[PDB]
Amino acid sequence: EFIMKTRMFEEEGWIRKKCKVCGKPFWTLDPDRETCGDPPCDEYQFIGKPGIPRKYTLDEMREKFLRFFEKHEIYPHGRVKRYPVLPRWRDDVLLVGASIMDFQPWVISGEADPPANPLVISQPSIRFTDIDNVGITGRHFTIFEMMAHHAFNYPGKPIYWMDETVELAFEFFTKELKMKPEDITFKENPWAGGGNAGPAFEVLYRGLEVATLVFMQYKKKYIPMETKVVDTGYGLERLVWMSQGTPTAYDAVLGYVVEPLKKMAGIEKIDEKILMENSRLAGMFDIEDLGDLRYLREQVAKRVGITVEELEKAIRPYELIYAIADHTKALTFMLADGVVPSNVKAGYLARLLIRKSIRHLRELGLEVPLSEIVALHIKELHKTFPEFKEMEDIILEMIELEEKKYAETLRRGSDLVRREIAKLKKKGIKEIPVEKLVTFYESHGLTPEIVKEIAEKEGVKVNIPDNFYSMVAKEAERTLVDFELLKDLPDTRRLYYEDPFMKEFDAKVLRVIKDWVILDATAFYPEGGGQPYDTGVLIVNGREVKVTNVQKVGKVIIHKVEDPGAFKEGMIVHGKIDWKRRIQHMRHHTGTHVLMGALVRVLGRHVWQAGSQLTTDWARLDISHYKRISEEELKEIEMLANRIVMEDRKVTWEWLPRTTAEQKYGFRLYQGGVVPGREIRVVKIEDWDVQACGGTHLPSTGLVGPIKILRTERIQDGVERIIFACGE
């Protein structure tokens, strides 16, 4: 069904072929190539023979890729600062897994401009599905950099497409990296991606997939997208490995940690051969899970000429160290970018990495706190990611707390499981199924190695699944008032955005549905952003009718009134807001913002809203934080907040197109989560705090009055709550 002719292929005489092994179509310059270049059709040919003529470091390659595309004479790209691995701009994924995710949904739908079109980027990406392969295959990482040039072809506005994309790739590979042209293949491999799909190439060189070229043009035959998006992905680590020729990708990227851990653990350094042959066959042979670690192991055993026991003896220490190295790097990005360990979402993933890593250290027989290993990452990488230096104290503290709290979790967890194993055993069970091993982790925090020595110690079975961790990983992703009769109406003019001191107004009745009145313009605040609705009255025929609720549906606001029969379509009414109720909310809402700037500064940049609610008497703010707020910190925050009131800084607002706002102010805007619209409403407290926000704010901080913090409470692991009161 899929085409894939390109101008380059035609002009340069590339041949389209069906692979003899996988049957799939691929393009080649080699008249003698019969296979697609992709394991198991072909094999890694570069271990001990770098296929890139000179050795590169991560830093060297990243810059090389970014430079080439930035300085291109026919298609220059804007260079774009990587985004956090924690997607603040969307609420549907836990972690960034791919550079394209920076630009979903808003840029692709056209609702937000690209930062630059076309753009070039190097995006740290995290993938938990490969986790059980890390340190075992020689090429899988939790955390890796995806380099990409992207182009967003909006209708009427071509940038570039397939012809240019494969010319660009081929140029970068052949002119910049000096790879052999007759050794590169472009394999056709249609792509489906959840939401959308299109034709794709895999670029293959000496058996390694060095790049993915994807042309998005269908969304959920399927259904053709309006915007055509060039979505590339080049693996930094794979490219570095292709230039080093080391027995594993880990020795090429994580040396600064692999070696230190070998020395400390003091481990009998392996026959290099075994490590080379493992990676070789691990290519040819995916862990499609099932039970095939055991077939991989048997295979490398026969090739090196030893038993699986002596193999396991020799490799395991390497497997452990590779995994610790990878997992700690991933935890540095995650924590730096704002992940607080916990039992939910990315906190749960951070916690999983911490616990998995600690157990690897214990299986090595290494007595070294995990934080020390993170420190190595901070030392090597802060040059190119300054944020690691800035966050260092918080990152290391979070690790130490988790390490310390893990030691207790384990003693009481051991006792608790041992008892419920014995229960299962006198219930005629001698196995323990996947599901229950998962639950043991999920609710007692024990990893399957621990369970098994407890279990076999009273006649019950260990059977740790090869894919245990990628399983547990899947768990992190847990889980109308008035409709449609509105769509045909104009957006309500929000007078409270023009003047948040407007207490009276005039307007025209557009609809009366049941007991909700709909105006053409209103100064009544609709519920949202933790700010309750205004109340007040509407006046019609000299008849005052109380407003008791004010909600928003799309862009149309509805007023709940006590007497719907007083109003008819076309009637002119006189609005009058309850000023006391409004003024107390304004104080609490702006207070909440004064607060957030104080919390961030006293606790740290990882501080993110998690919940927020205000009333006429008190407000509360829930935040992501990794420990109790101490009495002293409480007072430190209250002081700092009160200093900003007394200082009377300007509070201002403006609308900005989404990508502009983000690029000026960073992703801190997205506190209450994420807001639709081509343009967003930015509330700013001068040199203090800045937020994408819908509510009504005071012009000045002075107008908030004294801010008294009432108390603090834990809500759950990772979430602390602060309750305060504003005004004199």
Ligand SMILES: [Zn+2]
């Ligand atoms: Zn093939």
Ligand SMILES: [Zn+2]
């Ligand atoms: Zn707000």
